[PDB]
Write a protein that binds this ligand. Structure first.
Ligand SMILES: NC(=O)c1ccc[n+]([C@@H]2O[C@H](COP(=O)([O-])OP(=O)(O)OC[C@H]3O[C@@H](n4cnc5c(N)ncnc54)[C@H](OP(=O)(O)O)[C@@H]3O)[C@@H](O)[C@H]2O)c1
Ligand SMILES: NC(=O)c1ccc[n+]([C@@H]2O[C@H](COP(=O)([O-])OP(=O)(O)OC[C@H]3O[C@@H](n4cnc5c(N)ncnc54)[C@H](OP(=O)(O)O)[C@@H]3O)[C@@H](O)[C@H]2O)c1
Ligand SMILES: CCc1nc(N)nc(N)c1C#C[C@H](C)c1cc(-c2ccncc2)cc2c1OCO2
Ligand SMILES: CCc1nc(N)nc(N)c1C#C[C@H](C)c1cc(-c2ccncc2)cc2c1OCO2
Lengths: 157, 157
């Protein structure tokens, strides 16, 4: 089973402010929607509760409480380890989609990074892990918008 | 100035039938929308008419006729050499977006290919050109849909 990771990182490393993403760069959301279409996403409970279950995606949500969901596209797991154990039996690809705790736990296990660098330096308290040395960028594209952003795909190798 | 190329190819190389793309693969468009957001597209007249000027893209259209446009986001050029010469003045990046004739003319000059392979063998009379040997895939992601597709990015070198 392949593991991807998708995140938008502001220029100072902030990816979140409380439960929110502290920016709105018009168009960057299109990358997220395109790459995650009909994919399995692994998200922590805080980010899931904050984003909700968008259509045309499947969600594996991890929680140590007894958080539930009656949405048919949402599975809940008591641990990241159990999510992975089960996911590899029901799909061949999972996209790690946050938040901060989930990226910290999974960064060293993923095969492909999707990183949008957002041209802003906002206030926030959630950060992205430092990127392991074996990842290298293989594709880059710049976008002009209300807040500029740059999309970059990294591969392990 | 960098040139990219974005295309959706079916399994027998067909990309068009008359003016029409002879499939609809739900979700695939999102890739096109995401990658072309606020970008310059270089297109031939036939494709441009068939799609029209969808919003938040800028269009460079080639024609040998007197085809014109009122739209501020559309520029019309008598030749490819003229399109590229003029584009180099105002942008650092251009995405070649079709159709068959444009693709064939430009593929040897582009740096990056975005290819979605569409899991269908339709009838058509417009084919994508052969890919030059110095291109290599650097990223691949499968999507299941009403018609399956696979998205792959190629780099020259
Ligand atoms: N910028 C971006 O691209 C982006 C993307 C996604 C999220 N974010 C941001 O990230 C922030 C939220 O991140 P966060 O780190 O606070 O929370 P989070 O990672 O979204 O969720 C953390 C929760 O996940 C559960 N969890 C974590 N590790 C677990 C494990 N090993 N086993 C079982 N459950 C586990 C726990 O839920 P329980 O409390 O129920 O036990 C934990 O409280 C928000 O600001 C959001 O906007 C940004
Ligand atoms: N599957 C996909 O990803 C995809 C993407 C895009 C398009 N398509 C399909 O491809 C088909 C259209 O392709 P096509 O090859 O027939 O047409 P095209 O490449 O879109 O346009 C051809 C026209 O471009 C102009 N042209 C071409 N070379 C020129 C040059 N060197 N100088 C000046 N003008 C030039 C001419 O316009 P004038 O006739 O006005 O002089 C010519 O008729 C459609 O079915 C479309 O849907 C498929
Ligand atoms: C579009 C945002 C984004 N961009 C990139 N490049 N990578 C990501 N991983 C995310 C993300 C995200 C999380 C899942 C998220 C999505 C969304 C969201 C809601 C509605 N449409 C699109 C995304 C809202 C969120 C939210 O966390 C905080 O609130
Ligand atoms: C979405 C289709 C597509 N996928 C990929 N991966 N690459 C591409 N270059 C195109 C394309 C295209 C052309 C420009 C095109 C777009 C569109 C279009 C219409 C509405 N929203 C987005 C694209 C319609 C077209 C059309 O040609 C025939 O009719």
């Amino acid at each position: 089973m392949k593991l991807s990771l998708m995140v938008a990182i502001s220029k100072n490393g902030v990816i979140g402010n409380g439960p929110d993403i502290p920016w709105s760069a018009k168009g960057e959301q299109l990358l997220f929607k395109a790459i995650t279409y009909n994919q399995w996403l692994l998200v922590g409970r805080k980010t899931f509760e904050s984003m909700g279950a968008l259509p045309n995606r499947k969600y594996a949500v991890v929680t140590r409480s007894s958080f539930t969901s009656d949405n048919e596209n949402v599975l809940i797991f008591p641990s990241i380890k159990d999510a992975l154990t089960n996911l590899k039996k029901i799909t061949d690809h999972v996209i790690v989609s946050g938040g901060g705790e989930i990226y910290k736990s999974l960064i060293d296990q993923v095969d492909t990074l999707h990183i949008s660098t957002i041209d802003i330096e906002p206030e926030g308290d959630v950060y992205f892990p430092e990127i392991p040395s074996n990842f290298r960028p293989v594709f880059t594209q710049d976008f002009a918008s209300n807040i500029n952003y740059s999309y970059q795909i990294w591969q392990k190798g």
